[PDB]
Design a protein around this nucleic acid. Sequence first.
DNA 1: ATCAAATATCCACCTGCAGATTCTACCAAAAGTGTATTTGGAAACTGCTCCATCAAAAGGCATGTTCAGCTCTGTGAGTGAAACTCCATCATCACAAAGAATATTCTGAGAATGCTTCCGTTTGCCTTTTATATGAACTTCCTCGAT
DNA 2: ATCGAGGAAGTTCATATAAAAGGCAAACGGAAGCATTCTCAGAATATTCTTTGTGATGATGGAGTTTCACTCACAGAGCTGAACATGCCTTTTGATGGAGCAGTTTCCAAATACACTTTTGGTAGAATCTGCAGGTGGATATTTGAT
Lengths: 92, 92, 205, 94, 80, 18, 19, 103, 105, 99, 99
Amino acid sequence: RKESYSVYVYKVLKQVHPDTGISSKAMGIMNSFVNDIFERIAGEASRLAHYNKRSTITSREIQTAVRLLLPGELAKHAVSEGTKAVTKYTSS
Amino acid sequence: RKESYSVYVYKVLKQVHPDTGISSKAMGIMNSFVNDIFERIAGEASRLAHYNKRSTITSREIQTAVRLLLPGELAKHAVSEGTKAVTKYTSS
Amino acid sequence: MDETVAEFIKRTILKIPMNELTTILKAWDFLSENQLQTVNFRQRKESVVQHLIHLCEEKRASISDAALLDIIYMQFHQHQKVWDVFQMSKGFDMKQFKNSFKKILQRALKNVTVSFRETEENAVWIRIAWGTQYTKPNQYKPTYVVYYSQTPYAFTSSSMLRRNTPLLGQALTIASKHHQIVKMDLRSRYLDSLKAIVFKQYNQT
Amino acid sequence: KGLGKGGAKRHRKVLRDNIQGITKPAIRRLARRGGVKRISGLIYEETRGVLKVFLENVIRDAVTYTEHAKRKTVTAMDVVYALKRQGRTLYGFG
Amino acid sequence: LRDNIQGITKPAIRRLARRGGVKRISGLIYEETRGVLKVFLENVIRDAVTYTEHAKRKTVTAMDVVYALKRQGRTLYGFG
Amino acid sequence: SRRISRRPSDWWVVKSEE
Amino acid sequence: KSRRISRRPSDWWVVKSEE
Amino acid sequence: AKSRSSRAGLQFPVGRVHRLLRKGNYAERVGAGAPVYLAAVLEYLTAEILELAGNAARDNKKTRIIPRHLQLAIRNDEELNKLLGRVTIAQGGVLPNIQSVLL
Amino acid sequence: KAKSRSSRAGLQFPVGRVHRLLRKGNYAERVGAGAPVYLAAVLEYLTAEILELAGNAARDNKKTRIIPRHLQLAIRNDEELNKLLGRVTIAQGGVLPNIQSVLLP
Amino acid sequence: SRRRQGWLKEIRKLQKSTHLLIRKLPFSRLAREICVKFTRGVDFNWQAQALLALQEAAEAFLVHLFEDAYLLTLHAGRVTLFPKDVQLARRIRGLEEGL
Amino acid sequence: SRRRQGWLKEIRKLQKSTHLLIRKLPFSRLAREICVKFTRGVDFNWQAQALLALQEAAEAFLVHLFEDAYLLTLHAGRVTLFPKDVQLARRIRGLEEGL
DNA sequence: ATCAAATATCCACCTGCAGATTCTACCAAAAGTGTATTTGGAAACTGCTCCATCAAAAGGCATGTTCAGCTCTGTGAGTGAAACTCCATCATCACAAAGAATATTCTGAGAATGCTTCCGTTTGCCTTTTATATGAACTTCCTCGAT
DNA sequence: ATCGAGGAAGTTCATATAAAAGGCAAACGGAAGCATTCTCAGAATATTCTTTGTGATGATGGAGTTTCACTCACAGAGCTGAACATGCCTTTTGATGGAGCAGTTTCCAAATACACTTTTGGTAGAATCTGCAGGTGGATATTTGAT
């Protein structure tokens, strides 16, 4: 009854490696990794909308949450692959 | 227009010192001490009500948050002085 | 007073349902009923038990008499624990028996299983806890033995702690005026089912 | 320290060892992974000190989540949560 | 090669480490502490100008530094 | 009430029951 | 997918000059 | 015509805690007995770090608590250290610490 | 009928499960429409970046199935994934094969 | 012979693998004794996933302590550790990463 | 006298008081330079509380680095510091207390 | 040795910035009385899951004796940093005008909530099918050590 | 050189353990279209706050010489902690029934928001009224080190 991200992660593995498998406990780490980045980003983005006297987590206040919760070189490639996934969703 | 605790903390000092004064910058530290304890405790008691999947922060789910955010001997008094506040609040 | 008696009483009371909570405390005979007037029972059980703790903190709060509260609790919940039937032979109110109830394991405590609450139909209720020679006893996995001073049958609760089945028979046969103890085919849930299988075969031979 | 006092029966209530199950070569083989090329003869007493004060800063955070939701069983999610507030996030069992 | 980082002057770093209990400073800590201080100010002002450029202003205020040190791990009790 | 306030707080050295 | 430059830990307790 | 705080006997405002603790969305529903019990713990700490500082005012013979005397009241306590672990103080200073070993 | 928002975004991580979790956590009162498409990208790029390194962990150790050791040699041998996961000890893990300096013969 | 090689066979062996290093049943009887000094009286009940959740944190903590304690032995010209080099490796560490 | 006493009378003077130890206008000209290497081209504008907010952290972090880094001098039998004693004290704190 | 300028203390003054005190008026917040609503205690029961034994089972640890690579202390060549006399230039305070930038007030429109219908997609669940890995043997290969 | 002995890849091989394909129910959630709801960008405007400039200014840092205390290699006295070899007691496995205890479902009332209420005292902020701290000087009291 409890849902994972396991089927979605397995599609990412086949997209970047045609044959690489994954063990079951290795799928367990790929869950509690991707909730830890999720709870950091969507937890720290809450603090900005509580700071700047707003009420809506928008598509902008994840972007300044990405530029803090990541180190240097991994930031600029994440955000530039970030906004590309918004523009084609807009002009679909 | 931003409110502080400055009239409150000054009344606490008179209960344990009849003649001690406080400088106007030391009241500023007694702001960000008491909000930092406040923004921890309610910001950590939210995690228990999200864990057990209830929706009421009661007078119980602060108590197990008090026993985490404090060290050893400061725990036993702050909960025992805490429960002295509720018992003469109900039986009024 | 001690400090583990506060955690023990707080967890003992919450096992009782709200129906018979006033039946137990009037029959347990430990606190003054004028304090029961002060304890308003019609409110939340979280605030019920703490006032019961606070009205036991102003008294002696001994672990011996707080153990007696669990014994009366087991008399009114006999449909949960699984029971067993022993019987002795090779040899009344058993007055010389009660003189030395506790003749076992002298290096551990003065009395590990002390219990003084007698019941009619010659029923003795003794709460048997267990420990070892350098460990404190464990007050939450007990063993209950109901023995009669006329029938040599002993009604024994199932022991969640293993390894101590025949020494319980040795601590009961040597302390009595007997020599033999057996293990019959009587292990059921109830005590009225232990009437027509024990009181029918023994009392009408 | 030594609360729930030992002498309820007699002195020396340490009956077999109760602490020395962390064996002599076990603390060796822990340090052999870290790059300790040679261990002095007092670390066998020292690591038993540090490992006792690591459990009292986990289990106090771990039994409290257990005693909160009124249970008698510490779960796997309780220890993962207790180390998460501690500062040592664990990706095994969450 | 003139100025703009040697404003952290030569006896000022000395009088810092006097407070920590350093009896006698060697001859490279005068360059070493100027290295630590530059890699401390790039892990604050990055997080501090981020809050300013987010809520669209041009002024880094007092609350723009107390927050960015709170997310860093160094909560400050002076100004917030 | 009053608790015990311990002035040095020597905490890094492990210390046994003696 | 594209590529970033991912360096082995590139010893960081030793302070770096521009050179 | 009764203040909530005078029902408890403490001093910190019950209602101002009860006002803030809904506006932050810490939970969608806030119990009645909670912001009394939080108003004790927030006072017992602020009545603890003052009494140490207030006894630090006479011992250095300045009758007004200046922000030095908070720094020497926090770091000279075992149990208040672990609470304010990753926290510095403005206008702080350090403990008087040299050891003999350096001197 | 092109109604899967993930396929509309050209991503692979889901969109609607992120949009469901941004309200049951109480992170704000209203959650924007353009937000959880931007959160379903950054978690993809932080999932494709680890497994591309963990994919080269199994190939250079001559096995075909990524075991939890292979993430430990994938994360720590990055620069920036160290400083991201500074508080994370991976279970069934291991440490880096650190040949020290003064152990050289 | 007398001394073929004592340790350098063993360190490169143990860093290669990923086992556990403290045996489970003593490591359970250390926890249950310390679990009963808190929450007095009631010895609790442990899921078997919980004991394998401390042991992948304890034997990942101490292996990070000893390695980071070993960089103090090389700073003093020694090779062997001492309890100087663990007492000093906790005080520098700073009160939140092992007390 | 050849030397009366230099270091001991100066240290117990400085721990007694609560100054700031870096002069403000160089510390402003250090901060504005680092601010303009980010946020390309366009400068910014600083309130006079924020420059007294870093200086109550930078001279609260460097002073807490030196007292911690000095305990690695006494562990080697030295007295003087070195960059062997600062480049080791940024390590053991482990990536979140000075990098 | 006393003379000697420091090192330190107290006693009295003395502004002068700094808290402290009314008193504001009233805005804003809180306190009270019901209306109508609901989470969560509280009781009872299924059945997953873990303590507590017995037992091969050996794998791994405990004890004792040795030994070569350490740890500790002292010396002395060689040195790298505090101390100190000068002196300029770079940090500071005050100001004042200039203003870019911030904050408040005020309006409406594209954007989020909300209920509903209808499908697709994501689960647990075997289920069968399929495979990699690992442990074993296995030999051939082949570094390394004793004549 | 000569050649014995492990040590180490390198190969083969069965083999369960674990995982991938499949399937489909199906319980659940993402989605469309719609109806209605508002938070927040955009523009106009008083106005806090901060940059840029000046001239005094002098405390304070940069340069240099030095003298002593300190870091560094070498060598020898002492002791301590790895290899080792060998019983044996202790940790594993597993299989065990029992079951305490976790998880589910079902009721319902005692506690919670809505909201307008009237109150109201209560806090924040604004001029007035004190006095505690820092600095100066009163320089007397006192231990520093040279004749």
